[PDB]
Amino acid sequence: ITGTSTVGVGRGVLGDQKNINTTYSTYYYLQDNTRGDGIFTYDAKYRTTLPGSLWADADNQFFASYDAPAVDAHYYAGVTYDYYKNVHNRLSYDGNNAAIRSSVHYSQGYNNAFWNGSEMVYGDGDGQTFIPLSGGIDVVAHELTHAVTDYTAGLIYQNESGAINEAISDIFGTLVEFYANKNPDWEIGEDVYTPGISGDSLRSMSDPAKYGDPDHYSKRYTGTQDNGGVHINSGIINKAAYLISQGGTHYGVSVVGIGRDKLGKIFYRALTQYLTPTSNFSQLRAAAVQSATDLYGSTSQEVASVKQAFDAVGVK
Ligand SMILES: [Ca+2]
Ligand SMILES: [Ca+2]
Ligand SMILES: [Ca+2]
Ligand SMILES: [Ca+2]
Ligand SMILES: [Zn+2]
Question: Which domains occur in the chain, in start order?
């Protein structure tokens, strides 16, 4: 909508107060004119017709419980935008400042969040398995990273390329959580998962096996569920990325950790320069090795650590 850029204030899903960039034209809309060609947040009104209505508010105050999921979707879209721009010199998900659109209050008791090809969509959860999913910065950045992948490598969402596509989203979702620096960790969705249970999440990158996911290629899932295990076999790549960043000895193979920033550099380069729609795990290893070689040199610690991490998870 055409109007002046304004600044609202509200609470997110977890009761935290924050400022949001809004736009004024009769009502105050969730439209942030300060990043690219805009960040726009919509109300799906418990339906599944998308996008719904651009979020409109009478007073620029967003403290109702109904406001909370939209506060977070909008705000964490801005954080993710800032991460790609400031860290990777990437302007929005297409690299050309595409508008970032999100809808909240999708369906009723919907325990999930997703990128549909054009926008972000967040359920409210059923209050037991999930609370509103946009309250998780790693969930927001995970899903927006699918948009990044769709415009770059284009990793097909099935089998190995699919598990890479998933891992890439867990990796950058986690790096975005670290960038924002509020209780960061190597698990996925903990801030919005199971309000009655402390210390759990949907997935762990440091120990995929915690939730039954493979942490080594010899344990890969080879069946047909979950598009050939795209959320299952990502554990193998997640463990490798965790090793590259943090180090550790995994099934007897020692890895020297190089830290989060370098992991982010190597994997962004792999994503955008080397990976293709059909890349398998072995081809990911070669892309990551070639990325680390471009960035730090062929004899570097960084390259040796990438080789060790993939050796540790059984990927040659
Ligand atoms: Ca209001
Ligand atoms: Ca966290
Ligand atoms: Ca997390
Ligand atoms: Ca929990
Ligand atoms: Zn995903």
Answer: 6-154 (3.10.170.10), 155-315 (1.10.390.10)
